[PDB]
Amino acid sequence: VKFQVGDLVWSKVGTYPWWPCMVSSDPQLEVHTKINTRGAREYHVQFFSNQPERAWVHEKRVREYKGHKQYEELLAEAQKIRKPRPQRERAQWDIGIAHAEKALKMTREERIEQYTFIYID
Ligand SMILES: Cc1noc(C)c1-c1n[nH]cc1-c1ccncc1
């Protein structure tokens, strides 16, 4: 178990770019990590965004968030070929990064307090 609740991570989910997140406990399972139905480890994360979302993410698609400038190192893992950055998505990503940069300056307990989502049935 590489990550704990409140840890800042980048997550690569679906068609979206590497995205700033916080590890958190699933509101129903009450765990932040599990072994999936294919036998692989996953972590439960919250995406920093103006549109809050959560997901279970394979451990290979989760990375410690050390700072926003790490994005270039993540793009490297994959003439130089670069994907363009769609305007609306870029704007949402910049918002998420601003929150993650603020969270980086907080303690783990402060981050848990400030950002853990409230889930309503
Ligand atoms: C959208 C969306 N909805 O559910 C999930 C999961 C996502 C998602 N996947 N990868 C990144 C995001 C995300 C991007 C922007 N804001 C929040 C979440």
Curated annotation (Swiss-Prot):
Localization per record: Nucleus; Chromosome
Tissue: Highly expressed in brain, heart and skeletal muscle. Expressed at lower level in liver and lung.
Residues in PWWP domain copies: 5-68
Transmembrane segments: none
Similarity-based family: Belongs to the class V-like SAM-binding methyltransferase superfamily. Histone-lysine methyltransferase family. SET2 subfamily.
Record's subunit section: Interacts with BRD4. Interacts (via KIKL motif) with BRD3 (via NET domain).
Annotated disease: Defects in NSD3 may be involved in non small cell lung carcinomas (NSCLC). Amplified or overexpressed in NSCLC. A chromosomal aberration involving NSD3 is found in childhood acute myeloid leukemia. Translocation t(8;11)(p11.2;p15) with NUP98.
Domain notes: The KIKL motif recognizes and binds the NET domain of BRD3.
Functional description taken from the UniProt entry: Histone methyltransferase. Preferentially dimethylates 'Lys-4' and 'Lys-27' of histone H3 forming H3K4me2 and H3K27me2. H3 'Lys-4' methylation represents a specific tag for epigenetic transcriptional activation, while 'Lys-27' is a mark for transcriptional repression.
Name of this chain's protein: Histone-lysine N-methyltransferase NSD3
Residues represented out of the complete protein: 266 to 396 of 1437
